[PDB]
Amino acid sequence: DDVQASPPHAVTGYRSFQLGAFELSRDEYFARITWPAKGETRSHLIPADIFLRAMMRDVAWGFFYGWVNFDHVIGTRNYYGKVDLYAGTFNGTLKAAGVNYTENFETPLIMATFKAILRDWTNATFDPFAAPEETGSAFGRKNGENLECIERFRIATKRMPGLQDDSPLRNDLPVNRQFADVSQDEPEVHAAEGFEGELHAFSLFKYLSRSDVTWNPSVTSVCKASLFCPTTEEFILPVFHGNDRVEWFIQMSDEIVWDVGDKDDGNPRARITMRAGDVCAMPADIRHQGYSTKRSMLMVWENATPNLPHLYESGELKPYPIEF
Amino acid sequence: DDVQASPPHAVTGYRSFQLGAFELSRDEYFARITWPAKGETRSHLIPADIFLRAMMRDVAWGFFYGWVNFDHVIGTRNYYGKVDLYAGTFNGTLKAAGVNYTENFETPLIMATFKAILRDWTNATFDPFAAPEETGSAFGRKNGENLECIERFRIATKRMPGLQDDSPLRNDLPVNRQFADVSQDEPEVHAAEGFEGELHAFSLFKYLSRSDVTWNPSVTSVCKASLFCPTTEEFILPVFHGNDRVEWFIQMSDEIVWDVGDKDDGNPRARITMRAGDVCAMPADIRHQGYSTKRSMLMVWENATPNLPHLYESGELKPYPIEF
Amino acid sequence: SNVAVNTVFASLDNFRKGTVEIISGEARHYAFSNIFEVAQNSKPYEKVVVGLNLGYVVETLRAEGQSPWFTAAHDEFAIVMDGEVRVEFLKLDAPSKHGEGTHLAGELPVGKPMGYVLLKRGHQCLLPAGSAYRFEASRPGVILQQTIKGPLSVEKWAEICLK
Amino acid sequence: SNVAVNTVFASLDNFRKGTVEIISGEARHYAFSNIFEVAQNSKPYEKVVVGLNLGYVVETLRAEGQSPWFTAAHDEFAIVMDGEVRVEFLKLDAPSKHGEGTHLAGELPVGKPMGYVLLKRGHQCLLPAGSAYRFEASRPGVILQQTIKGPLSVEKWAEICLK
Ligand SMILES: N#Cc1ccc(O)cc1
Ligand SMILES: N#Cc1ccc(O)cc1
């Protein structure tokens, strides 16, 4: 859809953007969001690096599921064809004071606007998909582009990586510095005569060790609706996520810490430390955010069944998966 | 006092510290604080850069006035001889949940511990007093020290800078890049013979223009207990200050935006944008944090009369200074 | 000074279960287990469900010795999380065409041999639909299997998850 | 593209007041004002209070022409925020020994001249206790004075603050 964008700003070098009643602009340090509420224009600042990492995830994930929060004021709720953009709406205090605003959007329009924002606000010196130790600053005046980091083209996984008609392995990528000790050996495949290329196996740890992005579940095996979506996590999950289905985490290397709270209240429910080999169900009625000091291998196990929202709303699926 | 420190960690290179029931440690990305509440150990991660900047202020200001909040969990409260260290106690939700804890310390013991933490946790690469654009990373493993930055010292103002035996001027300091356009002209002092050095005047703007730290109110004129404490602000005030008395801000250059919240809740109350020449009272019952895109010049006006807090605590004085 | 990189992997011989710290509610809700503890306390090749989502399963297998021949009507996948497994593949003459979940293929499956794969830790292979496959393990290891709840899947949540 | 640095200062001829957005509460309690707007709407050297803290005050004065002679029992301070102001000093033979706040020193103050100081924008001078002093401005200017509430201090909060 048609993006509403201004001329580059005379001082900062950046364009402001309009999306329905929202105004998005950035300066040398902050993204700034404005919106109407009770007759006045309301504003909110978010540090530009925090903002960009968050929007980068929202764009790469296609708005994910449930509530993707940039911070405790700004967020989106994917409605699977339409996406709500909200400010303070899911914030007890702002909501009670009636200074919040929400507006609904056809996915392609908000997506186009968002891609355009990343393009414009991401300088050549900053990669929104990387951990801080891996990249430069998002701060300062407009200064080049980083298309290569924000437009990562990916062949979708049909079955498994490495298959001929499928998503490629990563032998042409450097091992990340925090996985430099991980074996790079491939499994041995021994095809019986007349069966060359009928058997398939690759090194998942090697494949992960060569991941060039953080907090990005990517499909590595497909069993009907069941998807294995491993990802390498460093620093902090760039958003806090409000769930709308049960999620499963299997921690494969190192450790991650999850703050788990009330989707609406924000009230603490649990603090989960996941170590190598741990398996955890994240319930459909919480929100959470992860912390991973060392780049670690996390398996996110997804379920791509279309009527999930119906199942949870109906009561066919409880907020937590297992009674025992 | 006698700090309780561990040996350096075999991997991170950092020491950990014990202050009463509080344990304070850091790794490559996060400072970690644990404490007892509701029959168990509770924990909280804060990015090492954010933590160090806040700790730096609390130590330079000798714990300041009232509440100094590192973030929405950890903070200290000055009793002017004794200091509380807390986790969650001034967060309405955490307190409601009963996971908060407060412990009381003699000022010398906590100050010695905080100074040791600052010294142990600040790498040669990181200036906890500067803006993010003025310094490097606080992340990674132990790597040198930055005594020159964490152990700044300048003479306390007695009456006014530039006077005999008083606090110095800054003619020996470079003009900060973001004040490069500020006049360096002094005022003309024409003394009448027999009266040399009896008249005193300097360029406050020149003075601030050469300030080598951010968010650090510093006395430039003393009128009984009335103190003028200007400072140069960039990025975000590294803490949320909770008032124990009334203060006033006078914006002298550019702009700063203040989030104003409840002192005891942390709950939003107002958003104040202060432009050049603006004058604002910050009531004794709020907390606040500022945002300044360009390094700006701010006058912070304090009343240093002793025992003021009791008058506010008791209700004898209203939280706001003036009825009209 | 220390510049070493240590990617911590666990094993049957050496693992440390994480922790669920409850502030409010019940640890039950998080179905929290650890695949190494699980394999450590299970029979060889018992397919222990450690994740269940609308009938899709993640199973943990203790690889020790030689498994039964397995088969399914749809694709499955195996990740070797510890040890070293050899996987033998037969292309069945008469593959299961309908149904879900791994099934016993029988003592002597009828079909051409396709070959085998040698999986070490961190390695993944496809278990193609309409094939029979068998696991070989000289030393105790751990296999993660992605599949669908079937006749062989064992549920024992109260035994394996925090409560 | 742009690498210029423009430190924004305001003046009588050019000023833009900020804003108080309320979520819960009253703008009133912030006593929010702008010194340049206050000087623009005030008599010459009318000591307008823009800050009050339990007896201590910050006064805004519109510098235009010559002020009366002022004096006080305790130190005071002036900062020039707009224009040029020349401050004359007089070491009185009989300084005020008691009381607070700036008082009128009279038409013909008795004492030895001490000299003068020239204050442009951003300059600050000491107004030493027991001296008398006065301001001279060819061009309209603005002075901030740090002192104590006295007989000259003018309060007009409902006029200068956001309601
Ligand atoms: N929820 C959620 C989530 C998203 C990305 C990721 O890498 C891990 C967890
Ligand atoms: N209150 C308060 C405060 C503390 C430091 C600073 O730079 C500005 C305001």
CB contact under 8 A, A30 and B291: yes
Closest residue in A to B132 (Cα–Cα): A139
Closest residue in C to A245 (Cα–Cα): C53
The closest alpha carbon to C81, from C15, C6, C158, belongs to: C15
Q: Whose CA is nearest to atom 8 of ligand 1?
A: A215
CB contact under 8 A, C2 and B38: no
Give the three-state DSSP class for B294: strand
Binding-site residues of B, in ranges, read 241, 243, 247, 288
Is the CB of B179 within 6 Å of ligand 2? no
As for chain B, the residues directly before each break of C–N over 2.5 Å are none
In this complex, the chains that touch C, judged by 3 or more CB pairs closer than 8 A, are: A, B
Resolution value (Å, 1 decimal): 2.5
Partners of B221 in beta bridges: B228
Burial environment of residue B269 by CB neighbours within 10 A (0 to 12, 13 to 18, 19 or more): buried
- Quote the ligand 1 centre to B70 CA distance (angstroms): 27
Closest residue in D to A41 (Cα–Cα): D21
Whether chain C lies against chain B with 3 or more Cβ pairs closer than 8 A is: yes
Q: Whose CA is nearest to atom 1 of ligand 1?
A: A241
Contact between A28 and A139 under an 8 Å Cβ cutoff? The reply is yes
Listed in sequence order, the residues at least 6 apart from A292 whose beta carbon sits closer than 8 Å to its beta carbon are A233, A234, A235, A236, A254, A255, A256, A257, A298
Q: Whose CA is nearest to atom 5 of ligand 2?
A: B215
Would you mind telling me the total number of residues written for chain C in this entry? 163
Q: Quick one: tokens of A224?
A: 């009907």
Between CA C60 and CA C67, with CA C62 as vertex, the angle to 5 degrees is 105
**CB atoms near residue A124 (< 10 Å):** 13
Give the three-state DSSP class for A75: strand
Q: How far apart are CA A273 and CA A217, in angstroms?
A: 19
To the nearest whole Å, the CA of D36 is away from the closest chain B CA by: 6
Amino acid at D64: E
> DSSP letter at B263?
T
Q: Whose CA is nearest to atom 2 of ligand 1?
A: A241
> DSSP letter at A119?
H
The closest alpha carbon to B274, from B297, B258, B293, B295, belongs to: B258
Q: How far apart are CA D24 and CA A309, in angstroms?
A: 36
To the nearest whole Å, the CA of C2 is away from the closest chain B CA by: 6
Q: How far apart are CA B2 and CA A20, in angstroms?
A: 60
- Quote the ligand 2 centre to B265 CA distance (angstroms): 19
**Which phi and psi angles does A107 have, rounded to 5°?**
-45, -45
Q: Counting ligands in written order, which one lies closest to the CA of residue B69?
A: 2
Give B-chain residues touching C24 at CB under 8 angstroms.
97
Q: Quick one: tokens of A104?
A: 């609904």
Between CA A296 and CA A301, with CA A298 as vertex, the angle to 5 degrees is 175
Is the CB of B241 within 6 Å of ligand 2? yes
- Quote the ligand 1 centre to B142 CA distance (angstroms): 30
As for chain D, the residues directly before each break of C–N over 2.5 Å are none
Interhelix angle for A107-121 vs A48-60, to 10°? 140
C-alpha to C-alpha distances, A39 to A36, A77, A85, A96, B273, nearest whole angstrom:
7, 25, 19, 16, 18
- Quote the ligand 1 centre to C59 CA distance (angstroms): 22
Give B-chain residues touching C19 at CB under 8 angstroms.
none
Amino acid at B307: N
Q: How far apart are CA C154 and CA C149, in angstroms?
A: 9
Q: Where are the domains of chain C?
A: 1-163
Give B-chain residues touching A133 at CB under 8 angstroms.
28, 137, 139-140
- Quote the ligand 2 centre to B212 CA distance (angstroms): 16
Q: Which of B221, B223, B292, B308 to mutate to test the interface with D (most CBs of D within 10 A)?
A: B223
Is the CB of B233 within 6 Å of ligand 2? yes
Q: Ramachandran region of residue C55, left (φ > 0), alpha (ψ -120 to 50) or beta?
A: left
- Which of B28, B93, B291 lies closest to A45 in CB terms? B291
Give the three-state DSSP class for A40: strand
- Quote the ligand 1 centre to D163 CA distance (angstroms): 47
The DSSP code sequence of D103-147 is EE--SS--EEEEEEEEE-TTEEEEE-TTEEEEEEEEEEEEEEEEE
In this complex, the chains that touch D, judged by 3 or more CB pairs closer than 8 A, are: A, B
Give D-chain residues touching A95 at CB under 8 angstroms.
none
Q: Whose CA is nearest to atom 2 of ligand 2?
A: B241
The closest alpha carbon to A47, from A216, A235, A215, A238, belongs to: A238
Q: Is A266 on the interface with C (CB under 8 A)?
A: no
Contact between C131 and C71 under an 8 Å Cβ cutoff? The reply is yes
Chain B, residues 45-104, CB within 8 A of chain C, namely 97, 99
The closest alpha carbon to B34, from B17, B14, B52, B50, belongs to: B17
Q: Is B227 on the interface with D (CB under 8 A)?
A: no
Closest residue in A to D24 (Cα–Cα): A97
Q: How far apart are CA B88 and CA B67, in angstroms?
A: 13
Whether chain A lies against chain D with 3 or more Cβ pairs closer than 8 A is: yes
Listed in sequence order, the residues at least 6 apart from B117 whose beta carbon sits closer than 8 Å to its beta carbon are B17, B24, B55
Binding-site residues of B for Fe(3+), in ranges, read 241, 243, 247, 288
Q: How far apart are CA A266 and CA A65, in angstroms?
A: 19
Q: How far apart are CA A20 and CA A18, in angstroms?
A: 6
CB contact under 8 A, D21 and A43: yes
Contact between A69 and A241 under an 8 Å Cβ cutoff? The reply is yes
The DSSP code sequence of chain C is -----------SSS----EEEESSS-GGGG--EEHHHHHHTS-BT-EEEEEEETTEEEEEEEEEEEPPPEE-SS-EEEEEEESEEEEEEEEESS---S--S-EE--SS--EEEEEEEEEETTEEEEE-TTEEEEEEEEEEEEEEEEEE--TTEE--HHHHS--
- Quote the ligand 2 centre to A171 CA distance (angstroms): 53
Of the CA atoms within 13 Å of residue B206, those in its CB half-sphere come to 19
Of the CA atoms within 13 Å of residue A168, those in its CB half-sphere come to 9
Measured from CB, residues less than 6 Å from any atom of ligand 1 are A 215-217, 231, 233, 241, 247, 300
For residue D95, the Cα-to-chain-centroid distance in whole angstroms is 22
To the nearest whole Å, the CA of B94 is away from the closest chain A CA by: 7
For residue B295, the Cα-to-chain-centroid distance in whole angstroms is 16
- Quote the ligand 1 centre to C52 CA distance (angstroms): 19
Is the CB of B263 within 6 Å of ligand 2? no
**Which phi and psi angles does A154 have, rounded to 5°?**
-130, 125
Would you mind telling me the total number of residues written for chain A in this entry? 324
Q: Is A15 on the interface with D (CB under 8 A)?
A: no
CB contact under 8 A, D124 and B179: no
Amino acid at A279: V
Ligand 1 atom having least distance to the Cα of A288: 1
